[model samples]
Target chain A: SALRVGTDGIYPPHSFHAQDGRGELTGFDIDLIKEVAHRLNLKVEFFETAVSGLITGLDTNRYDVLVNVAITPERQKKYDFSIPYIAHRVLLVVRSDQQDIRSFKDLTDKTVAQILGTDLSRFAKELKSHLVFSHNFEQSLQLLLSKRTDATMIPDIPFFNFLERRPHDGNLFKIADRMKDNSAVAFMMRKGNNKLTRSINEILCAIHLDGTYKKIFDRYFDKNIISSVPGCSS
Target chain B: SALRVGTDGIYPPHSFHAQDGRGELTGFDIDLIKEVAHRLNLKVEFFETAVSGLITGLDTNRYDVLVNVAITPERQKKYDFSIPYIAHRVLLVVRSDQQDIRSFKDLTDKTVAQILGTDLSRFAKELKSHLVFSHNFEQSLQLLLSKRTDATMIPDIPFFNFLERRPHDGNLFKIADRMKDNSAVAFMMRKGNNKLTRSINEILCAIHLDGTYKKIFDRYFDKNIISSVPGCSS
Candidate 1:
């Protein structure tokens, strides 16, 4: 059977439009699912949408799997997750010369930028910071870089990818604080599907043992993000 | 079936004694071959010795495969190699404060340190400079640091691994030159063992596609050492 996969096509370096326009969709998540399907003796079909539509598609059974879904307690009630492929650290980013904002707690009474509806925005508000909303990571970084905001929070993967692609601006920011939670990116299916989840987990273990995972990861990331697990050699 | 493998047990980060004494034999290559054997449905036995003894063991049919063998023209005639897993660049390293040596050409009439009978020694000899030989990479680096030797050449993987394990000394040296060739580490079997070569190659591709390769590689290396291959996403 073909695996109908849903992905948010706007997240670069993960899954996104390949050529900046309506070109064929491709990225880390796309390549990864395709390889998994090949190994599982199943074909793959991709359905693209924004984050909200992707959730709706999964809920409606229009997609059998979702790639690059963030694992959360609330989402776990709705989706089944394969072993996490990447563990992410949340970083508080500030200008290279910024002195007032030294850590997450320092954001109180300060102006912080974040995406409109992300958990980062919620955290910004929880810290009692005046939120300057931006639609995406790039804009949020731009706002902080231009001195429009005191700081912003970003996930480590995308932030590292941004630095990899922009070497000149690498030294322009500092990670004032880091939060390493159990938060991670995983392949998701509908809740209550233990058979498929177990099957995918087996395949995940196989690829990880073989070397396929490192090849794809190296294409985008400068470092490994996967944590250690039992029976895994490394 | 069990595969008997041979390895030099003294090289750090790749294959070496885990502790100060005759402790557990562990390293990137050791872990890699174990995983490969597990996937291939074969048990493995390891023979530890110097590089010369490892080669003699291979010739005498006492070992089925050798791990961490550097692929060279002469060795290719005597053995079969799995696809190169690590593409190493020979780098000329010197004290960060040394300004006299800026590149390979600048080594004229200078003292270059290297391990005897290694490719790095050949490179040093080729540069027509006075050669000061060390027993290993650490001693070579120490020589350069202590100003006992003007410069030395080392593979990129070990150098990076050294820096990762010792960040304090990372900035104390500089890479003044680099050489990228077919000089890479690979698993080796006796010449004409086509079946074992083919089988191991299949497992190599699998791990490279899955995340296992990255986990092991990252355990020892700070960067991706795997070279690019067709049909693999990374």
Candidate 2:
């Protein structure tokens, strides 16, 4: 009935509300939508739903647009995505000593901790045994720190962003690799709603054309971090 | 109820007997037993049992001993073992161009086709994903050749033996560096059978001390196909 965006709850600095204890939406995703709504002159509303329900809800047209979406071919079949706005790469964080776990293939049978109900959950599922889904990113990091889990998967830039905020826990942890082309973050909408989809796309293009996209992306991502990693979104 | 030996079925060159159509049981294991039998001068009555049942049988006293058994700490809790005999390594056979299927770690989450009654089946269970079990080695081979299964875990030597028999179709495979120790195929006997266990160990020592052990080992395996990858045998 409305533009519904299902999100993994309280992913700080990404989709969290501002207030001491009140329900108020705030984050990069929120700000970007405000700009889109302002430019399109449309009173688009937000419906908070579970992260797992986002894809299915899109199929049933429960949501006209999923605001926070990672562009992947599997999702493209059932949903259309706008041109990517935010840059979010996949990052593999592992125990500093274990050089053997350098990439996705290295994760087989090894227990990789990941935040449940996030896109990383699906990534963990793809690797199967090498992965163990945890309750949150902090929990995953704790498991890795405690030597209980082999590794953890997180959004590269966001993880780097978090790491920059808080220094690494000693030298025991590290960012294994930054996956390329994984940075693109776009809105997920129903498979064939071309009109609404085009409208959203037009808004993204207007934002890009007006340099609004660069401004928002720059606010969160540091220039030094962006330049160091190849194909990092800026 | 004498000594019960849990054996992989007589799949030629390992342990088989002709008269019973079970094939002639001959290999390093056979010679090891013969020498142990000679030292003790005690008629080592042999009871044949399934590989899966071997360990449980020893613990339950269903059989006094298990011949050609791999050593692992998990089994050590139940029964004691003799010394080493033949060693063999695990190999991965995948379709040509499937260069990705190169390591034990690679095959962890992937489905592996294995002979129903082979030692490899035991190893397959230790891995992470679905191990599609088959009735025999030939059936497992068919699954690998037809791409019905991702790969098959065979002792590196027998894999070569299979290659010798069917060279052209045995497209491509590799011995993973993630090798496990395959020697020390000891006689798993019931707990507190210290005297008999010592006698078995003496027999093993006597056989190896003489030329008998190598003579028998040469009949089935050469130097190249020995020493299987080491791991904690389940």
Candidate 3:
């Protein structure tokens, strides 16, 4: 049997193309899920799809599990999650010199740049911010840097991952970071697919306890995974 | 429709009999789930059962959801969890006067008292500690206080809650509290019961978002629930 995995190859350093010769998907999620499959005694099968189609792909039986899916209230209605393998909480960011929009309550009627359909975008909407929706985190940051938006809300790991790649982006500054959320990113399966979820969760616990999880995490990111990502489920 | 809730009804401050004339069960879980039922437009029907029987009760269709259940690898296999509303990370405690044991490595070959069939018990077992089983957290503390066991590992909120009630219990001390694991006590549902699970999770988010969750939580808990519980899944 094989573990059919769904992934979006655009999330760099997460599950994206690290090498472009033949365009094989490689990153943290790819490595981690491959290891999870290995522990479950299942061969690996990757089905790369758009982030929007990732969930539907599972519903269509095109994949057994989807990685890089964060737990959101609406999404939780249709998908069951394995234990979070990594977490990236959302942050409110603005151009380094921008003023007046430093707090959540300050965003009323302001223009905020965020991805089209993320929890952060929804949060921005809730605060009555007119959203200049961007397709990616970088695009949102780019919009903010160009003074097209008052601020942007995006996930932390990717923002930090962006800075690690481009230390020259001094225009971006985290204006707010006290949110108690994690894009507690985990593997998502069909709503009732308990056996696969269980197997994946157990294998995750195994690798975490054995230090294999940390080793894989450190390969993709530069910080201590345990401290950076809360809840080792220890 | 009615929400069938499985509860032990003995875990004080969480869900237990506060008034004993007719033995009406009322506590944090009771209040919270009642509010959840109200939001979902369902009557609340509670089945008071033993902790061990709670999962089986759900399996037998006697209950639809069980509250105060923590995420465990074994439990997650048979049941699914809602977002954690309250969390209590475990702590390794020795008598306030005891000095020999201090770290995870020190537990080897040492006697530890913990509740049987718990995640902490399993952790102690994996560490090769000689374990004396107790039925409750107080009993585990009692064992350690009497020197029947070298140390006891237990959930923190209960320990802190225990201290809040019995402030004179100066004999107890937490030697270890840095663990990332939360007794991320959440509502649990039978495997494959996605619709009910989704309904409860959505209502939970609703309550939390609108400040109703804080009102219910702060009524029973002394600390801020968001800070006490690691993730609001915010």
Candidate 4:
């Protein structure tokens, strides 16, 4: 049976549209799932949707797995997470001129911009900062750049991806210290889908052990973001 | 069948004994082969031997493969190499106070230190510098520090490894520009061991694709050392 995989196709570097008008999606997650399927000797078919719908699609059995999903305690009740392939540290992004805001604690009583319905926004609120919501990374970054907000919380992976595409704007922002907690990103399957999840985990372990994981990670990320997962005897 | 592997366990970071008198060997290569074997569902055994004997052990069928083997045309004539896992760039190391030497070209009339019977010594000779040969990295580095040699040619990987274990002495030498050419490090198998070579290649491709390769690499080296291999489509 062809392995059906769901992806947002909206996230750059992880998954996104090919932009060639062929309606094809491509990115780090796309390439990874394709290779994993190939290694497992399974044909893979991709379904594109909104980030919000990615996990919902898995509930309907529309896909065997959802790529680029963050593993959270709430989601564990509905889905099982394979080994984590990416580690995302929360970073405090401020305008380059905002030298006073150098740490998360400095965000106290400051306006923190973030996308609505994201972990970033929740963390911003938890930091005791005034929360201003945006719709995406670009908007949040733009707000911070314009001084409309004092700071914003962003994950290191997306920030690096943002810089990769808009390198000229890299000097416009300063990344403060990372948060103490990091989010583990992994593929998700329905709770009962142990066979497929185990297969994915096995392949992930194989690739990690063999060195393929690092090459792909290096191709996209400059910093080390690979998190600990099950079977990591090291 | 258990995979018998031979290694020159004197090279730190890549492969070396623990040196605690327990005769236990551990390094990047040691951990890598153990994981590869685990992924392939095979048992692996390690045999510590001289670097000169690593290849000859394969000729005698004493080991199935030799780790930390360089893929050169000369070796290719007698053994098959798995995909290149590491790219080694030759670096010129000079004392911190050696202001006259900055690059490989600066060694024109100077004496450079290097390990005997190794590629670094060969490059030193080709650079038109007087050769001051030593037995190992420690001796060559010691000679350079004592001002007995103006500079030394060393591979970046070993140099990084040496610094990791003796970080306090990192300020003693400065690494100059890397050589134009790089050496590809791979595993060597017997001439007709096409099956094992192919298996290793498959796993290497899988790991490189999955991001595991980068994790192991980052654990040992600070820089991105992964280079293009035969099967890397991206």
Which candidate number has the best TM-score?
3
Best by lDDT: 3
Query: Candidate 1: RMSD over Cα atoms?
Result: 13.1
- Candidate 4 lDDT at B8 equals 70
Ranking by DockQ: 3, 4, 1, 2
Q: Rank the candidates by lDDT, best first.
A: 3, 1, 4, 2
- List candidate 3 segments past 4 Å from native: A1-4, A19-24, A47-64, A103-112, A116-133, A171-183, A192-194, A220-234, B19-23, B49-64, B83-85, B104-112, B116-133, B171-183, B221-234
Interface RMS for model 4: 16.7
Q: Distance (Å) between predicted and true CA of A47, model 4?
A: 2.7
Residue lDDT tens for model 1, A8-74: 6667778867667489878877888888889889999888765546777888999889987655544
Q: How well is candidate 4 docked (DockQ)?
A: 0.02
Off by over 4 Å in 4: A20-23, A209-211, A223-234, B1-234
The sequence of per-residue lDDT tens digits that candidate 1 reaches over residues B1-234 is 899999877677778777653899888889999988998899999987655467788889899888876655456545666655555566789988888887788988899888776666776788797899886787889899988898988877678778877999989999987652324467878866555665675576567656677778777765555332211111
Whole-model alpha-carbon lDDT for candidate 2: 0.60
Top DockQ prediction, candidate number = 3
Candidate 2 lDDT tens digits, B1-234: 234455554544455565655555664565567566766665546566655565666666665766655544344444554433444555567766466666766777788888664556666777774789876555667787777888887655556666765788676544444343232345666755655654564454445445555566666675565642111000
Q: Which stretches of candidate 2 lie over 4 Å from their true place?
A: A19-23, A116-119, A128-130, A168-172, A180-183, A226-234, B1-234
TM of each candidate vs. truth: 0.48, 0.44, 0.80, 0.48
Model 1: residues with Cα > 4 Å off, grouped in runs: A1-234, B20-22, B180-183, B224-234
Residue range with the least summed lDDT across 10 consecutive positions in model 2 chain A = A225-234
Candidate 4 lDDT over B27-125, as tens digits, reads 777777877887788998887766546656778778888887654534554556665566666678887777888777888889988777665567668
| Candidate 3 per-residue lDDT over residues B1-234, each given as its tens digit | 788998877676777786641478898889998998998899999998766567778889998888877666667666777666676666778888777787877898999987665667888999999999987777788898888998988766667677877888854675653464444567888777666766787677667656787788788777643233323344
Cα distance off (Å), candidate 1, residue B134: 2.0
